[PDB]
Design a protein around this nucleic acid. Structure first.
Ligand SMILES: [Mg+2]
Ligand SMILES: [Zn+2]
Lengths: 55, 14, 110, 1111, 221, 147, 56, 94, 170
DNA sequence: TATAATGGGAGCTGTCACGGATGC
DNA sequence: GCATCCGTGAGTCGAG
């Protein structure tokens, strides 16, 4: 299909929760030793997806 | 407008 | 860590992050190169028999993404694991020969 | 050759040390050469005295000392070190209870040292701290814009040293004080100061109607304590009004010398304006338990006296240079020092509570980190701390003399209207009216005048000669603008016989206003015209003949001149070109009288009168900040007798001690085949042949090998999959050999990096299987020569880990630096300029046979279009050309001073003497007038240039006195149909060179978030196609081109990939897709809790994330 | 045949005031306040100025530079506003069909004579050239038909007719009166001025308007 | 412009002025849903009033309104256009509340979307134009005749 | 004598009568001969070319 | 100036339509390898190499010249898109 | 910011036809690089595209046949020249490039007025329209020779000036 | 993991004009 | 209705 229009509207907490792939429960970013993302933190792969393709 | 001042004022009421 | 928004210059016009390349996403050139490699590989594999091209494709993961064992490819073609090892080896032999002749796949060796 | 200097003006004093504004300022700030007991309370000393004693245990300051630098300057530049001295302070800890005294000298870190030339070396790079102009502290009275018959009194302290206070008379009649955006009645504060109705009535009563407006019964009723608590409740609402808190706060706002500092200049200006004496730098005092007024009553009194129209009371011009002052290096640095010191003091006070209250040394109490950080912050990250401009010696000399109204504690660019950017009448002799940047910074960045010096208070002073009776003394008085306004000052060119004024009427100034005056009325006289202009402006001959707008460009552009291998001083100088070189410190001179023992490319050894043998090493092929080569060449020979101050070696861009920013070329002013079009310039290939305008440039390349979690980066000659052709010029260790020629693509330093873990694609599995070759563990990370660069490798520096004397930043095993040099010949697109603001790019280099030429066969060097002259109104270049012709034939150079110069008659005379040589030679050689010279003479008398009936020789001489000659077109052999202006002009090659600016990109690096190409040549960036460019494409109605710019050529990932593949396959480029930056916009709006939905015609959602972002 | 004179006269370079500064006197200079000095600069650039004269000139030079610097931002901003306001306007069709129009006056009421006088040539050309005629117009025995785009010649003819008292104003199609939604139409627009011929449907006319008004901005004193 | 010797056609200034006069203010709502003092485009109130008067309903009484280029630009129906202009937060909060839909009519909207603009070669007028050679044309014609 | 205005008029009239391609050709020609003659013309500037009138 | 640009602007109601016709035609030429051309062997656009005259690789030049001949037919709704593409692939395979 | 773009210093090119500009070869080699790779494959200059690119990477590996190839590539094509500030639509124009030795872009005198370009060190940006469509738009709508009159006043934009006027008047 | 300890600290000053809400 | 306060704007490309 071809885009003919762009709508903008307020988002219910429901819709925001429907966007979300997970809750970020922790202020952590990445592990100080491994440099890998910390689980439940802002960079978590379980939430936002894998760092490397199909792995 | 200053959260610190506000908090100090609330603290001072006890 | 340091801010990507760290200012460069005394004007507000530029940021540090603006000078940092993306090393993750493939460049147009790299994508192109990989595509050409797949196409030259298929061209070279067409100079084999369907069966001996299929054995190689099945063994090296070009099909299905997994590398099949000799016992699996052999069981798939109804032949013996030794038979399939043999047709794989003669297939690879023809590939190497056509390669020495046409010099096509050399430049993709980096 | 002979040097003939014009002008009758005798300057009683020489130019001041030119970098003294930097040097003396910093010297005064550090007081390093003064023994501690003899130090004045100023600079660093004053900062310590202000910060200490730290009360709470009591910590007191005794004295400080500065050590010697750990490393010399050259070493610092080499190793990325700051050139600096260790600072120590002797502190004594005292317990006032016990009487106990522990005393120690604590190390406070290092402070950067100024070099001999007034600059700094900060982390290996040379920097200048630019002086900052601002409003002088003091007490000012300005007209209130709203109410005409009323005024505002403004009390201004030093920046960061207090709030400003404004005293106003409100429409209701009561006098209000404004502090920290809050207003209150001034009467209340007066009551806190202990004033009573009686005192105010007797004091201010003389000005009738205002004092009753000052009267408030309730305030006078309550004693100063109640008034202090009341005032505190006004200033700090919601804060419980404990009396001690009120005392502390008001003291800190007004009487505290730590939190409130009027300048010393602030104090002086206040005392002078209000006619009082300050006991200190604060608006009031805390003495014997109460508050005592200092400032407020005199300022209020002056305000009322002004409103009432009392004689002797004036409003202040805030752009007057009496009210505007300079903060030099010392003051700025000292400010940051004071800040770091206050922080260190906070730390001390906090340490005086915790820990053991008994056992403490001064060493335990003091953490110097805040101080070190404040200073390191000032020198590294300040706006006033700038990368030094050292393109040529004059560049840095000028840089150090610049004055900025920008920077911290000063104007922003919107904050700057016309008033500030204006040339004030008081700029005369102080700030140059000419040299300022063209564009947005105009009037904000300015330059110190040549004879100007900044006094101890920070006001710019200019010299004048005393005139008593009609006699001009040789005694000079440096005056501020305020003191200058008192006298009647005659112009420097006013006629003199001996020391007596020889004119019946003289041209003078009274408060900047030009006036005709009798010799009896002349109090002072200008030292020189040079004093009106900056150093750059003073280097422009015939400046009086140049329109200011162009002279500006001349000034600024001398800054951009590149040092040339064959560089020469101009044939017409102003007489400053020697001094500039000397003050620059680039050239080398002899200390005392003596004899030269040794002369080398690398060094000069001199045996002086003392008998002592001094060796001067010479800086050879060193790379400046801008990559121009700084190198010294010996000007003396072995056994030569030299005197004190005699030239030993020439620095860069100097010839025998004279400033050489360019070359002297033979120029013709005439159009040539449109190659001259619109300021473009035509030059002769002869210039390249003889290596005129050739310059040396050095670029520095650097690479680090560091520890990785994947294993070590290694600098090695062993690089995977590389031919011996590729490795040829690399040594055993992998570094390119000295003397090798490197071109784009060539390896400078070989390096391997351990491959990031990856699963080889099935394609790579099959390939690897076909060739039977293991994929290597390491990847080729080598440093290569970038596009458009390259040259000869002149140097390599290698620094490893675990070798003596060197330690790198954490994780870094080794660092390699490669210095690559290039000899740059003048080429098409390179930029030339003269000192008059004539500038142009070289569009054509013709072979010598096409060049216009004189009858005797001499071809011209440069051809300049006359169309550049008339609109620009810079005629100085013309006079320069004429005098240059005369000098070309007489074999001589001239000094024509600014505003007292060679005038037309004298130039005509020189031209005649020149013609004799240009022609009489020919007549003696047995040649008569040419046929074509006759034709040209015919057309010339048709033009009214020559008088009809005179001999051809007489007419040719008539033309030559007009600076015009017969010129032959090298293509035809036929003459140009009219006589043409030809002569020697001084022209410089500027720092803007096509080699540096030429850039192109097919595909390349992209940005992280936006996925759009990076910027700049250095990142291999794409050009910015901006809003206005898009507008252009829209107005053309070119939709597909525009769409390409927005998609295939930028952030459409699928699109650009597909486009590349299609183009290399010969297919037409594919239909574009969604730009990644739109997806970025959508997600960013989702982060703002806004739902942005792309819809089809049926109002159904369209997914531009292609299922990837939805569960 | 003097070079300055020739350059000035031909329009190759130079203008009278610049030549006046070269061979003449430099003239009156203004203080930073804008107020003019009583003493003018009697010198010319050929003669050379005096340091006092030169310094006096610098005030005005600087004021000019600051003027320019602060002006380019204002012009730029204006241009961006205009672009944002006109960007959607495109020629979307041939005729919106409107019967409406505007009458371009050939005469301006003169205030000093308190009577009508002829507008200047270029003004009329700016209001007329390349416009479609709203109604038929007969002047000097020529029939200018309804729907005719005015050639520069047509305009000159109307001016000559106006001088002959035949016609005091011209009915003309204009974007003001155009009924086209989201833009204008070919007829109400007229000539695409760059081609001296009817505008093509699809030309983005608003952008061109904003660029046309905006470009000279830095030259307005 | 004339004083500066700048020749500029009245036409362009008229395009702009036309956008300045784009809007109207309601004096009386009539039988419509509109409110007194409410501002809207002249086009929309003309369409509405011809929809009411043809329905036998009292039409809206309105007044001409002149707003400067900034205000006019900020008031445009397109929120991508308005939000890319200036005052982004205001434009976007009102747009987001209203559930506004951008129809992608003008240039800026499409440029932001990386789309093919509705002007020049992108105009719907010239966009769909086909080219065919006479040989292939006649071949296709015979093919269409034989069905 | 041909100057800015007459030449501009010439260009415009040529655009009207002869079209784009020919006017482009005319422009290139005018450029060529203009430059060519400008160089041999003997136009220059000396200081005496700025002539102070006796009337001053 | 492009040769016969005035006549080309003559052929159309809107210049942008000229651009569309030229562009699409050039796409046709590239796609079918120029063998669908309406030009005659002596009308073929030429390019000077070191070897000598060869066919001009530039399809837009070709398309403009072709247009000038008159042998091309342009407009809206001349033929369904699929049918056109297929008839062209039948007449000039790839 | 965009791909297939470049920038350099401008120099007058009197010898140019109105529809032409001087374009430095090294710039052209980069701007057209993919096309050049394809052409280098068509002619025998490289076995394939990868080898061709590897060959263009080192400047000393560049032989003279690739320059002829590049001449073949750019044939009939135009580029866009732009100069900031772009005040009106003539701030961008299309020109057929003439490859030149040297690092400067050569600009035709007649277009200087529209760009407000001059030779005191001004620089210009170059862009390559990629598609048949973009190239068509450029050659037809944006070409310098096709826009001779101001869209603002309707008067001639590209017209004699400076030296040209001077000579003709003389 | 326990002596007692009980309300912060840094302010930032040379625009300038408009639209729009809000205030006697 | 008219003061007044707050919030929002103030050219482009290059380099750094
Ligand atoms: Mg310029
Ligand atoms: Zn209409």
């Amino acid at each position: 299909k071809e885009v003919r229009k762009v709508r903008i509207a307020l988002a219910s907490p429901e819709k925001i929760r429907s966007w979300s792939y997970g809750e970020v429960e922790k202020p952590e970013t990445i592990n100080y030793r491994t440099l890998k993302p910390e689980r439940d933190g802002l960079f978590d792969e379980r939430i936002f997806g894998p760092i490397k393709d199909y792995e | 407008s200053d959260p610190v001042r506000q908090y100090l004022h609330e603290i001072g009421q006890v | 860590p340091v801010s990507l928004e760290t200012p460069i210059g005394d004007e507000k016009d530029s940021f540090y992050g603006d000078f940092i390349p993306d090393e993750h996403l493939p460049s147009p050139v790299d994508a192109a190169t990989q595509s050409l490699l797949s196409e030259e590989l298929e061209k070279a594999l067409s100079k084999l028999s369907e069966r001996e091209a299929m054995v190689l494709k099945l063994r090296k993961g070009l099909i299905d993404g997994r590398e099949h064992t000799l016992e699996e490819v052999g069981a798939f073609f109804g032949v013996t694991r030794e038979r399939i090892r043999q047709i794989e080896n003669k297939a690879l032999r023809k590939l190497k020969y056509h390669e020495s002749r046409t010099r096509k796949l050399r430049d993709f060796l980096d | 050759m002979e040097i003939k200097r014009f002008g009758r003006i005798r300057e009683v004093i020489p130019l001041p040390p030119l970098t003294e504004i930097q040097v003396e300022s910093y010297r005064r700030a550090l007081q390093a050469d003064v023994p501690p007991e003899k130090r004045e309370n100023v600079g660093i000393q004053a900062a310590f005295r202000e910060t200490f004693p730290i009360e709470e245990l009591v910590l007191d300051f005794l004295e400080y000392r500065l050590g010697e630098p750990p490393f010399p300057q050259d070493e610092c530049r080499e190793k990325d070190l700051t050139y600096q001295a260790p600072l120590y302070a002797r502190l004594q800890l005292i317990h006032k209870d016990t009487g106990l005294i522990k005393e120690d000298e604590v190390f406070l870190g290092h402070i950067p040292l100024m070099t001999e030339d007034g600059s700094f070396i900060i982390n290996g790079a040379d920097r200048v701290i630019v002086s900052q102009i601002h409003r002088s502290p003091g007490v000012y009275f300005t007209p209130d814009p709203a109410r005409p018959g009323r005024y505002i009194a403004s009390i201004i302290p030093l920046p960061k040293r207090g709030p400003w206070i404004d005293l106003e008379v409100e429409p209701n009649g009561v006098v209000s004080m404004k502090v920290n955006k809050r207003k209150f009645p001034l009467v209340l504060l007066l009551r806190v100061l202990g004033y009573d109705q009686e005192t105010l009535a007797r004091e201010l009563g003389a000005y009738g109607e205002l004092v009753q407006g000052l009267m408030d019964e309730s305030v006078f009723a309550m004693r100063p304590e109640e008034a202090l608590i009341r005032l505190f409740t006004l200033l700090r609402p919601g804060d419980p009004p404990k009396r001690d808190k009120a005392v502390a706060y008001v003291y800190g706002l007004i009487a505290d010398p730590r939190r409130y500092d009027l300048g010393e200049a602030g104090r002086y200006k206040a005392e002078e304006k209000l006619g009082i004496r300050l006991s200190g730098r604060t608006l009031a005092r805390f003495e014997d338990g109460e508050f005592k007024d200092e400032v407020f009553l005199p300022t209020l009194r002056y305000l009322f006296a002004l409103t009432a129209g009392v004689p002797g009371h004036e409003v202040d011009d805030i752009d007057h240079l009496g009210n505007r002052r300079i903060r030099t290096v010392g003051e700025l640095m000292t400010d940051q020092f004071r800040v770091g010191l206050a922080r260190l003091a906070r730390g001390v006070r906090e340490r005086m509570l915790m820990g053991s209250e008994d056992s403490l040394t001064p060493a335990k109490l003091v953490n110097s980190r805040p101080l070190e950080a404040a200073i390191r912050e000032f020198f590294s990250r300040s706006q006033l701390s700038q990368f030094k401009d050292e393109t040529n010696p004059l560049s840095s000399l000028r840089h150090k003399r610049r004055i900025s109204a920008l920077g911290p504690g000063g104007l922003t660019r919107e904050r700057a209207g016309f008033d500030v950017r204006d040339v004030h009448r008081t700029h005369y002799g102080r700030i140059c009216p000419v040299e300022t940047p063209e564009g947005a910074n105009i009037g904000l960045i300015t330059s110190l005048a040549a004879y100007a010096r900044v006094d101890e208070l920070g006001f710019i002073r200019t010299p004048y000669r005393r005139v008593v009776g009609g006699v001009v003394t040789d005694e000079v008085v440096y005056m501020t603008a305020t003191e200058e306004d008192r006298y009647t000052i005659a112009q420097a060119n006013t006629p003199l016989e001996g020391n007596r004024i020889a004119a019946e009427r003289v041209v003078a100034r009274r408060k900047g206003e030009p006036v005709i005056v009798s010799p009896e009325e002349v109090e002072f006289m200008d030292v020189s015209p040079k004093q009106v202009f900056s150093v750059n402006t003073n280097l422009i001959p015939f400046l009086e003949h140049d329109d200011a707008n162009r002279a500006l460009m001349g000034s600024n552009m001398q800054t951009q001149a590149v040092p040339l291998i064959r560089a020469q001083a101009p044939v017409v100088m102003t007489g400053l070109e020697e001094r500039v070189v000397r003050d620059s410190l680039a050239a080398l001179y002899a200390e005392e009288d003596g004899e030269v023992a040794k002369v080398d490319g690398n060094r000069i050894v001199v045996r002086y009168e003392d008998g002592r043998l001094v060796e001067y090493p010479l800086r050879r092929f060193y790379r400046s900040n801008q990559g121009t080569a700084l190198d010294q060449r010996p000007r003396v020979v072995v056994g030569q007798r030299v005197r004190k101050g005699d030239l030993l070696a020439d620095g860069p861009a100097s010839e025998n001690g004279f400033l050489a920013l360019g070359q002297n070329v033979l120029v013709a002013i005439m159009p040539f085949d449109g190659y001259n079009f619109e300021d473009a310039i035509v030059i002769s290939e002869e210039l390249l042949k003889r290596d005129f305008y050739t310059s040396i440039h050095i670029e520095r390349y650097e690479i680090e090998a560091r520890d990785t979690k994947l294993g070590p980066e290694r600098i090695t000659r062993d690089i995977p999959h590389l031919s011996e052709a590729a490795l040829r010029d690399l040594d055993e260790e992998g570094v390119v050999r000295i003397g090798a020629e490197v071109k784009p693509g060539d390896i400078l330093v070989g390096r391997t990096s351990f491959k990031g873990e990856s699963e080889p694609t099935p394609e790579e599995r099959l390939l690897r299987s076909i060739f039977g070759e293991k994929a290597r563990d390491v990847k080729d990370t080598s440093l290569r020569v970038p596009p458009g660069e390259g040259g000869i490798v002149v140097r390599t520096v290698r620094l490893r880990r675990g070798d003596p004397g060197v330690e790198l930043k954490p994780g870094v095993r080794e660092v390699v630096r490669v210095y690559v040099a290039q000899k740059r010949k003048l080429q098409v697109g390179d930029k030339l300029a003269n000192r008059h603001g004539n500038k142009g790019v070289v569009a054509k280099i013709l072979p010598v046979e096409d060049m216009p030429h004189l009858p005797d066969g001499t071809p011209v060097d440069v051809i300049l279009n006359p169309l550049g002259v008339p609109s620009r109104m810079n005629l100085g270049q013309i006079l320069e050309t004429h005098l240059g012709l005369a000098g070309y034939f007489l074999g001589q150079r001239y000094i024509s001073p600014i505003f007292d110069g060679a005038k037309e008659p004298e130039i005509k005379e020189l031209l005649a003497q020149a013609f004799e040589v240009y022609f009489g030679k020919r007549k003696g050689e047995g040649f008569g007038v040419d046929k074509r010279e006759v034709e040209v003479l015919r057309r010339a008398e048709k033009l009214g240039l020559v008088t009809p009936g005179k001999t051809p020789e007489e007419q040719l001489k008539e033309l030559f006195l007009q600076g015009k000659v017969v010129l032959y077109d090298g293509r035809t052999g036929e003459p140009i149909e009219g006589p043409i202006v030809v002569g020697q002009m001084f022209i410089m090659k500027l720092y803007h060179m096509v080699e540096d600016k030429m850039h192109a990109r097919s595909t390349g690096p992209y940005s992280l978030i936006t996925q759009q190409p990076l910027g700049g040549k250095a990142q291999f960036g794409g050009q910015r196609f901006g809003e206005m460019e898009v507008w252009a494409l829209e107005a053309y109605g070119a939709a597909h081109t525009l769409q390409e710019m927005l998609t295939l050529k930028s952030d459409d990932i699928e699109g650009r990939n597909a486009a590349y593949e299609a183009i290399i396959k010969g297919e037409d480029v594919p239909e574009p897709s969604v730009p990644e930056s739109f997806r970025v916009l959508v997600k960013e709006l989702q982060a703002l809790a806004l739902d942005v939905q792309t819809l089809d015609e049926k109002d159904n959602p369209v997914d531009i994330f292609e299922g990837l972002a939805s569960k | 045949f003097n070079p300055l004179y020739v350059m000035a006269q031909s329009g190759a370079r130079g203008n009278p005031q610049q030549i006046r500064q070269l061979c003449g006197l430099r003239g009156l200079m203004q203080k930073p306040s804008g107020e003019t000095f009583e003493v003018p600069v009697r010198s010319s650039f050929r003669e050379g100025l005096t340091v006092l004269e030169y310094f006096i000139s610098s005030h005005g030079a600087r004021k000019g530079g600051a003027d320019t610097a602060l002006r380019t931002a204002d012009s730029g901003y204006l241009t961006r506003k205009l672009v944002d306001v006109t960007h959607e306007i495109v020629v979307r069709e041939a005729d919106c069909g409107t019967t409406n129009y505007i009458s371009v006056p050939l005469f301006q009421p003169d205030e000093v004579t308190r009577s009508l006088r002829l507008r200047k040539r270029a003004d009329i050309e700016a209001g007329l050239y390349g416009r479609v005629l709203a109604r038929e117009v007969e002047v000097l025995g020529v029939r200018l038909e309804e729907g005719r785009y005015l050639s520069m010649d047509d305009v000159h003819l109307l001016i000559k007719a106006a001088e002959a008292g035949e016609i005091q104003e011209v009915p003309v199609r204009s974007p003001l009166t155009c009924q086209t939604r989201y833009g204008v139409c070919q007829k109400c627009y007229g000539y695409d001025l760059s081609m001296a011929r009817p505008v093509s449907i699809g030309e983005a006319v608003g952008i061109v308007a904003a660029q046309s008004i905006g470009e000279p901005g830095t030259q307005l004193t | 412009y004339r004083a500066q010797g700048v020749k500029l056609h009245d036409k362009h200034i008229e395009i702009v002025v036309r956008q300045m006069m784009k809007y109207v203010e309601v004096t009386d709502p009539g039988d419509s849903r509109l409110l007194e003092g409410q501002v809207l485009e002249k086009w929309d109130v003309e369409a509405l009033n011809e929809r009411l008067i043809a329905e036998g309903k009292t039409p809206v009484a309105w007044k001409p309104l002149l707003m400067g280029v900034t205000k006019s630009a900020l008031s445009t129906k397109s929120w991508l256009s308005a939000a890319s202009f200036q005052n982004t937060t205001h434009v976007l909060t009102e747009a987001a509340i209203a559930g506004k839909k951008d129809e992608l009519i003008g240039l800026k909207e499409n440029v932001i979307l990386g789309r093919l603009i509705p002007a020049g070669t992108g105009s719907d007028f010239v966009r769909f134009t086909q080219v065919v050679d006479q040989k292939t044309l006649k071949a296709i014609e015979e093919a269409r005749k034989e069905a | 004598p041909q100057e800015k205005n007459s030449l501009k008029d010439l260009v415009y009239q040529a655009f009207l009568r002869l079209g784009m391609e020919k006017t482009a050709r005319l422009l290139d020609a005018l450029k060529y001969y203009g430059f060519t003659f400008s160089t041999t013309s003997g136009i220059t500037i000396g200081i005496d070319d700025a002539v102070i009138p006796e009337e001053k | 100036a492009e040769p016969g640009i005035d006549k080309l602007f003559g052929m159309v109601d809107s210049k942008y339509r000229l651009t569309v016709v030229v562009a699409k035609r050039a796409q046709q030429l590239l796609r079918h390898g120029f063998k669908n051309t309406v030009l005659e062997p002596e009308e073929r656009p030429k390019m000077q190499t070191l070897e000598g005259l060869f066919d001009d690789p530039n399809a837009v030049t070709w398309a403009m010249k072709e247009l000038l001949t008159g042998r091309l037919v342009f407009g809206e709704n001349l033929v369904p898109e699929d049918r056109l593409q297929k008839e062209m692939e039948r007449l000039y395979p790839v | 910011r965009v791909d297939y773009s470049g920038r350099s210093v401008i120099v007058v090119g009197p010898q140019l036809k109105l529809h032409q500009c001087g374009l430095p070869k090294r710039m052209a080699l980069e701007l057209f690089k993919p096309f050049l790779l394809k052409k280098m494959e068509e002619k025998g200059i490289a076995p394939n595209v990868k080898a061709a690119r590897r060959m263009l990477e080192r400047q000393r590996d560049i032989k003279d046949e690739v320059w002829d190839a590049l001449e073949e590539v750019i044939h009939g094509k135009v580029v866009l020249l732009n100069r900031a500030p772009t005040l009106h639509r003539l701030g961008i124009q299309a020109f057929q490039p003439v490859l030149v030795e040297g690092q400067s872009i050569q600009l035709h005198p007649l277009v200087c007025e529209a760009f407000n370009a001059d030779f005191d060190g001004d620089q210009m940006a170059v862009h390559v329209p990629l598609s048949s469509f973009a190239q068509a738009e450029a050659r037809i709508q944006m070409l310098s020779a096709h826009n001779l009159l101001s869209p603002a006043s309707g008067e001639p934009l590209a017209k004699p000036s400076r030296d040209i006027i001077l000579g003709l008047y003389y």
